[PDB]
Ligand SMILES: NC(=O)c1ccc[n+]([C@@H]2O[C@H](COP(=O)([O-])OP(=O)(O)OC[C@H]3O[C@@H](n4cnc5c(N)ncnc54)[C@H](OP(=O)(O)O)[C@@H]3O)[C@@H](O)[C@H]2O)c1
């Protein structure tokens with residue numbers, strides 16, 4: 001755990017659930033809990049939260065864990081920023097998860113998108129279609145949720161310092177963002193954005209810590225952290241896997257990390273990261289692999305407002 005401005009305890013390692021398929025995700029979450037995971041990262045857009053919910057309700061009753069020891073996170077999709085929709089999204093998420101409250105609710109992407117069914121609505125240009133409500137509007141609706149004891153804190157994802165500044169400077173702000181969940185690994189180090197978020201008492205949660213291989217768009221030329229020779233060199237030095245090393249890198253930097261898996265053996269491997277330490281040389285070396293490479297760069301909505309990736313941090 002990394003303590004939040006809330007004086008609350010987010011576990012430093014959690015299980016990611018994007019692309020975890022129906023039928024394998026329940027068991028993945030069950031295994032996760034037995035192996036000691038308590039933080040689980042979820043999203044409405046993942047279309048598997050109900051199955052994640054089944055896993056949690058079981059272990060709960062089964063007495064393998066207590067709900068206050070769990071830390072469950074979900075996100076709000078940009079096509080749902082309009083106030084009545086923020087609440088419909090949330091209730092679906094909450095109900096699927098079979099929870100009475102979320103520990104953190106995040107805005108998934110900063111730019112609001114045209115409402116409807118297309119999760120990614122575009123023009124016959126391929127470009128995305130903006131909507132009426134902004135993320136500020138969404139935050140207001142989200143703030144209501146914390147007042148009712150249904151969410152315990154709020155956070156953002158895929159926000160640049162600019163978006164965070166815009167949010168912290170909002171009139172009437174009732175609730176501050178606890179974390180900024182972004183892509184982070186040795187190819188995308190994120191030094192400035194982390195510096196910035198820490199200087200504001202906002203934690204950083206690193207997504208795609210392993211390089212997201214299984215992302216659909218993966219091209220074979222694309223860099224590959226899991227088979228990086230120099231990463232595997234350092235892993236071997238510690239009788240550990242490359243995945244282990246990639247995960248531990250964040251922890252040593254005070255950054256929360258959430259690797260994804262539905263393979264039981266790997267789910268277990270990915271948390272045996274509290275029994276070894278990378279040296280200073282090893283961090284410095286791994287830090288110097290930065291390439292400003294992003295595995296999740298599919299949206300490309302540079303034309304719309306508040307596009308996070310164009311900025312330096
Ligand atoms: N806020 C956001 O926008 C956002 C974006 C992206 C991701 N995320 C979150 O962060 C998590 C990040 O992961 P990702 O799925 O995007 O990428 P990732 O964790 O970096 O990659 C997952 C891949 O690694 C494989 N894998 C897992 N553990 C392994 C190990 N020990 N050895 C070898 N291979 C291993 C998995 O395969 P198996 O599953 O088959 O084991 C899966 O194919 C997500 O699941 C999601 O919860 C959030």
Ligand SMILES: C[C@@]12CCC[C@@H]1[C@@H]1C[C@H](O)C3=C[C@@H](O)CC[C@]3(C)[C@H]1CC2
Nearest residue numbers: 018045108109119120158296297298299
């Ligand atoms: C094609 C979609 C529409 C359905 C969801 C798809 C993916 C889902 C993914 O979680 C994601 C997260 C954020 O980094 C935003 C970008 C992607 C890559 C996203 C692009 C749009």
